[PDB]
Symmetry: C3
Subunit: 565 residues, 3 copies
């Protein structure tokens, strides 16, 4: 039987003398019953004392803890469900665990982290694991720059062998008080080191970061981190849900997020600003936040099976805003985009700026009666910006009673759709026998007063303006037009879309929209100019018919036939 | 030294009196050696006894277990490999574990769950973890409606912070005896609550559900659950592998399945019936089951890198059947579709109904000599239904010795391919010096007797029916025709496919099929009317020519150029 | 209180006699403090002793270890941080663990595996888990054929119930000394069994395999294994990073890799040679290695959100080489392709052979000034081989100052682009008034001397050779030409690309490249013949202008407009 000691204090005070003897510590703190274990006496060891796994008695004799498996924080005097600052004990336990390439467990309970000293996790040596349940790390009184950083101390080995073997952080709810200047998690390094830090294959999993300034911020050497079941919400910074600043060194390779939830920012968002940066999000959700991309160049974001939505929010914030730079690519593959009603969606929820690319694959474009994107764009479409959009396997909501809209200018079926030619070329104008009829291009005459429009004022007989383009099945389509009836003696006309085969035979599937009699700029086509491309179609023809005696302006004649583009 | 007690019974019987004293329980059950630990005496505590972590001695004094890490079921008297019902002890241990936001471990062994009382896991509080190995939960004698449900007790906090921190279920083989009315796992809530249940980020991993009525069924509040390495097999219900019923409240956001296996249903299948429901399957396999989607609208299922196959099965069941509703989308991206031989595949293995969409990306369409889809469709193609099919990066098996077939009517190269115009518009008819030979549209004369056909009976000189459409390289093509020869002297004629340049000159790569001399409706083109689109092609031409003395009906001239 | 014994030896030596008595083993090895636990005396057990969980005392009485949870290797006398061969104790502990369907833990430490006896993990019964941290399994002195194999003992059940419930291997750095004939991990069976082995749902996670002959090799029954955070590097075999040999039985269903890193092979690579084999790589990276696919038929590899790159390498090795077979499909969806500078990239980094297919989706094609692919291909393009390439949502680096290049021959905008017709068909020749100007096809006259070229030698007035093809928005393009000026009186001419709508109206977005005056074969178009397709474009026209008095050969006029119409 091994001699027994009821507390770490009693273990240290006893004049141990039997080299090699095993002794039992019953508890670190007297009367608690946690943090005990077996220790081997070594009278000759000169190992450094740490009051946890290497204990120096008052006579200098060492007691060396026998550990099997992970180090536990209570071995260093940490206590569960305590008001005392636990960060010193966790930091000391972590320093030791890292020194022997062993993970650190924190027993499930609540903890408070106070002070201002970050814990720097070295993923090549040891992770910190809340074990096991809903481990709560209250950092509301912490005043340092970052609570945790994760960054390797090695430039190559053994990081290339070890980072992947265990997570760097697991099982922790880490939260602040939205104090300015206190970030939650730094992924990588604050400043550029003299050598690189080999961080690839480091995992953060089953953690929540909440109520920091930036909850999660990428630093230098942020490459091939993976995140599983990570939640980030309710940060202070406009960029606080997840921030990738510009100018990072040795960063950007396949930052990966599996089933992560980025949400309820209450003004905080995701912003990717670093060039040459590649991120992959699988089955993630982006809720009540915007995903900004303003990298100078070469950002590639791939969202596979993700959701973008606004649950319970009246905000007109965008979902994805690729706003600057060139050669930036954003993929939405599968998943969903959900647009619950709000007082009026007055800007595009997706935006892709010049020289950038937004790709939609296998996803349904939503529609809602509250859509009012023309307030921003001048016309009724889902996506803004002068970049490029592609579609593959995209579904339109062709049976939505409120309507459907085209997705983007870059998918325009018809040439000179916005009268950007500065004339009516590409359009066939047929005034018929109306010699007094007038059809004219007008500059600064569209909805904004800054764009071209086509004015049609027929006399005696109606005027038809039309255009034909090649089309093929399979496909689905939606068109919107901006129309301003100045005067009309009745229904002012109709916009129609029809299909022909190669032989010129008219096919089923034609649709039309009456213009009515209401004056002023209005959207025509929402629940009328839409449908499926009929099998056998080889041409699509748009016709704008204006009746005799009417005076109507047309702008932004935007049809999209969605197919693989 | 801490005083020691050899059993929970002895711990409770002792007249504890020293407030604050630590004592050691050696074992819950006498002589077993499981479930012991340190306890702290509290003479003043009024905590409720649970015979596990809060023990009330016979004199009223409390003993409070010191726990570090998860709660274990043996702390409440559960025993491994016992014939006694373990569900009460696990349920009591779980109630406590959940009350202190701590997961519950069940030591690896076999357990019997009897009775009829489900365990309701609250993923915002605590999961149940089989630790660690092949933990066997025998529910063959359980008679309740569900074994496990998983549903948060919170509408927002702390669920928004906690659901993701640990799994709800891990490491368990949970099985029944296929008793009607006994389901395995309920994902969410049976009925609509007064407020919502915040379930997002809840995980089920490394579990098998087997031999229930419905193995896995979604309830209300089924949103952002994730499943990893979950197996579901051999259920009783036609919908028993995975069932998402219609009409769920607060459900449908990104239900996610990673490397899950849905298989060997022996009559049970997957069915998604809820509208506005979005599911993602990554490297899953669907084996010897059908994936049905009949949501009224707005289902989106994305299968990335999955396999659909029929290993060891003679069944002609479909693989994917999007059978009703509108605005339903099913994506197959990468992965594989495997069609082992059976006595005859008499219906299409993929089906997409009107107003729905089936997208194929980066996957190879298989072919097998046992394919007989015409028995359903009237004609030889891989996919059924009046919906829309798209392809991107799809490969055809052009060098499959048994043949190749077109994929879908919605990809038809040619106009009026099925004589659905009600006339021969879009088709060029040339008998040359056409006098006494017969070429006629016949209604209700095709393979099923309900569709149009074209009859040709030459006496004079042969007839050519032709059509040209634009095409571009690169591409792969396959055509099937339905042909009915009544009589002919020798070879009855040929169907040919040729390619032209922009100016109309013929290119290499043309193919043809002899009609032969067998009578009755037959498929022409399987291993003949297929190939790669030749370099320089800008037009594709189909030509049907019939010889003197033959009398032949033609129907369903279906070419697909994929790429 | 339970009687206590200080070592396994002392436990065995004692004359136990009281059936049912619980006794405490303090340590397996005297004085260490590891491997102890409670044992129950059993006078009725006739179980075979294993010196771990079933102990036979010197009088024959059995002592049955009370275990809760996994078996631990130290229960069988394994020791941490020891230079004794630990493989026998681990193997004995594993044999027992599998026999009771319980996983085996190895306490985190370093271990040496010597000898030549593999451990055959049965995933239907038990995994081996390094617990928990950077567990180091030194196999440098092991001389057997494989260190670990993973293969089920069952043909159906309970493998169909059990394989998925726990990993087969977790948390281990397993390494050799690059000895020929010693592989690290065999996935499945070495030879075909008479019955199948049901391996689906078996996981290997958080392991590194390093410095073996083949680090990871697929055997028979290799189906529905999943790998998470697995590293494979620095193998000896040319195929040693990951090898899937031809001829495997019962194999190929959805072999799945999540966030795995395949890298730094120093001559070792990935090779997929088995037919009817389907692999999925999600957020993996392939670094300083080639991914070879030479399956006879029906390989399907899907890479979602992966990176292919050459960090720190001067090697001109390919990234992906689909080199043989037919009906092989390789998908690159999202992620990145990175081509750091080297002395000159003289072959294509992607190659797809005849009858195979390489699909690019939502990824940016890189460009670098060191690109010299024409040394292999004859012309300046990114991808080699006579197979097919498709694009969907692909971005070109249109603003890269060094240039941009077309991707592949199969995406050629223009017909007879390589003069492979053996004539000048599809090209429109306009000599103007200069009738004696020479425009001719020349065989074996291109850059390699084995391909056709077009010689243009105008007299008096310049000659224009042109071609028009259909195009549509959305799109972007890059063209390269091989040009050989023999003689010229000045700037030899220019190549230009312009866009028209369906009605023949000219659009913005035209580009041109001067030929200059330097003689000899050169690439024209790198930073000139590129751009975005204008909205409303329905035709693209290339024109090659050669001035009077110039004598120029043209070859390989390769434009790619992505997506190709
Ligand atoms: C305004 C609007 O956009 O309406 C859409 C619905 O239109 C309906 O047609 C009517 C028109 O709106 C009316 O204006 C009028 O129009 C008539 C014209 O049609 C006619 O031509 O001319 C008439 C004049 O003479 C004119 O009056 O009447 C029509 C007919 O009534 C329907 O089309 C309806 O479809 C539904 O019903 C039809 C049918 O019975 O005919 C069925 O076929 C459909 O299956 C059925 O859906 C339209 O509803 C949308 O339908 C889409 C498919 O076409 C579907 O994709 C879409 O659902 C998506 O969007 C909703 C809202 O964003 C999502 O719902 C959310 O889901 C979340 C979970 O993911 C959940 O958390 C959300 O709850 C939160 O938010 C809600 C909320 O209000 O949004 C709150 O209530 C909660 O408190 C909060 O927690 C929410 O449920 C869904 O997931 C997504 O798929 C349908 O909206
Ligand atoms: C030669 C080369 O390819 O240059 C490309 C850059 O061209 C620049 O233009 C200049 C030309 O090169 C010059 O030739 C000349 O050209 C003139 C013409 O412009 C004019 O019209 O005609 C003249 C004829 O008379 C002609 O002389 O001058 C021009 C102008 O200066 C720029 O275009 C440059 O872009 C950058 O600057 C522009 C700008 O300010 O105008 C910005 O708009 C861009 O945003 C900015 O990038 C070109 O650089 C590339 O730009 C691409 C976008 O267009 C971008 O995608 C690409 O980056 C990719 O490739 C690099 C290299 O592979 C990747 O970088 C690596 O990233 C790794 C992590 O993923 C990292 O680990 C690597 O580091 C390791 O390896 C490196 C190494 O490179 O070997 C080692 O050094 C490290 O130690 C090691 O750790 C590496 O950083 C990047 O990730 C990927 O996205 C840009 O290279
Ligand atoms: O094939 C060769 O020529 C040589 O290949 C190996 O050489 C090793 C290789 O250069 C290794 O590169 C490291 C980087 O140093 C490290 O920064 C990290 O690089 C990533 C990069 O993959 C990605 O694109 O961008 C991220 C930043 O976003 C960047 O961090 O990992 C790679 C791969 O491990 O460095 C070691 C040490 O210098 C080299 O040894 C073979 O080992 C050589 O033998 C071989 O000659
Ligand atoms: O930006 C704003 O306007 C406000 O944003 C936050 O508000 C919180 C947000 O409304 C939160 O919504 C919860 C839902 O209550 C919950 O049902 C769940 O919603 C999912 C939904 O994402 C998906 O589309 O469909 C599933 C069902 O399939 C549905 O369950 O999650 C979301 C996100 O957490 O509710 C809380 C509590 O009411 C709101 O506070 C900010 O918190 C506000 O400050 C901000 O003003
Ligand atoms: O629906 C039916 O007709 C019958 O379905 C079940 O029958 C079971 C099924 O045939 C099961 O197949 C096993 C294979 O034996 C096994 O090799 C493995 O197959 C995979 C295959 O999915 C994939 O394509 O290729 C890999 C190799 O790369 C291959 O290993 O798994 C499947 C699915 O579990 O075998 C059992 C035992 O013979 C059958 O019982 C029902 O159980 C029957 O009741 C039903 O009649």
């Amino acid at each position: 039987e091994y001699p027994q000691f009821s507390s770490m204090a009693k273990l240290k005070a006893f004049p141990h003398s039997e080299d090699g003897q095993l002794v039992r510590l019953l508890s670190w703190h007297e009367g608690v019953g946690l943090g005990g274990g077996l220790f081997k006496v070594s009278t000759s060891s000169t190992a450094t004392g740490n009051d946890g796994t290497v204990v120096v008695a008052s006579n200098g004799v060492r007691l060396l803890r026998v550990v099997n498996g992970p180090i536990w924080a209570d071995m260093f005097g940490a206590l569960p469900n305590s008001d005392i600052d636990s960060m010193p004990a966790v930091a000391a336990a972590y320093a030791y665990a890292a020194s022997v390439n062993t993970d650190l467990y924190i027993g499930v309970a609540t903890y408070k982290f106070k002070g201002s000293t970050p814990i720097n996790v070295d993923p090549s040596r040891a992770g910190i694991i809340g074990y096991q349940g809903k481990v709560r790390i209250d950092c509301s009184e912490f005043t340092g720059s970052i609570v945790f950083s994760i960054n390797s101390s090695y430039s190559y080995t053994p990081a290339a062998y070890y980072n992947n073997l265990s997570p760097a952080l697991q099982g922790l709810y880490v939260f602040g008080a939205k104090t300015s200047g206190v970030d939650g998690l730094l992924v990588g390094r604050e400043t550029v080191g003299s050598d690189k830090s080999y961080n690839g294959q480091t995992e953060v999993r089953e953690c929540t970061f909440d109520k920091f300034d930036r909850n999660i911020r990428m630093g230098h050497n942020s490459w091939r981190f993976v995140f599983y079941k990570v939640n980030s919400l309710n940060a202070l910074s406009p960029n606080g849900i997840l921030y990738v600043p510009a100018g990072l060194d040795d960063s950007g390779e396949i930052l990966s997020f599996y089933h992560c939830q980025f949400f309820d920012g209450a003004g905080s968002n995701i912003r990717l600003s670093c060039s040459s940066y590649t991120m992959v999000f699988n089955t993630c959700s982006f809720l009540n936040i915007t995903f900004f991309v303003d990298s100078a160049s070469s950002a590639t974001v791939t969202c596979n099976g993700c959701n973008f939505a606004n649950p319970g929010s009246a905000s007109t914030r965008r979902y994805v805003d690729i706003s600057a730079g060139h050669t930036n690519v954003f993929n939405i593959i599968g998943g969903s985009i959900v647009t619950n009603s709000n007082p009026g969606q007055t800007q595009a929820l997706l935006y892709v700026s010049t020289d950038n690319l937004l790709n939609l694959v296998g996803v349904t474009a939503p529609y809602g009666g509250h859509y009012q994107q023309e307030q921003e764009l001048g016309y009724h479409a889902f996506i803004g910006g002068a970049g490029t959009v592609t579609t593959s396997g995209v579904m339109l909501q062709l049976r939505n009673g409120a309507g459907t809209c085209p997705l983007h200018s870059s998918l325009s079926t018809f040439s000179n759709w916005n009268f950007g030619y500065g004339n009516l070329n590409a359009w066939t104008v047929d005034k018929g026998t109306g010699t007094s009829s007038v059809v004219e291009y007008l500059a600064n005459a569209g909805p904004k007063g800054t764009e071209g429009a086509m004015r049609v004022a027929p006399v005696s007989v109606g005027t038809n303006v039309s255009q034909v383009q090649a089309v093929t099945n399979p496909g689905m389509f939606s068109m919107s037009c901006m129309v301003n009836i100045a005067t009309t003696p009745g229904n002012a006309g109709q916009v129609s879309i029809g299909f022909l085969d190669a032989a010129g035979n008219s096919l089923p599937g034609g649709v039309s929209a009456n213009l009515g009699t209401t004056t002023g700029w209005q959207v025509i086509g929402k629940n009328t100019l839409r449908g499926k491309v009929p099998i056998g179609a080889k041409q699509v023809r748009v016709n704008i018919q204006t009746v005799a005696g009417a005076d109507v302006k047309y702008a932004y004649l935007l049809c999209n036939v969605v197919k693989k583009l």
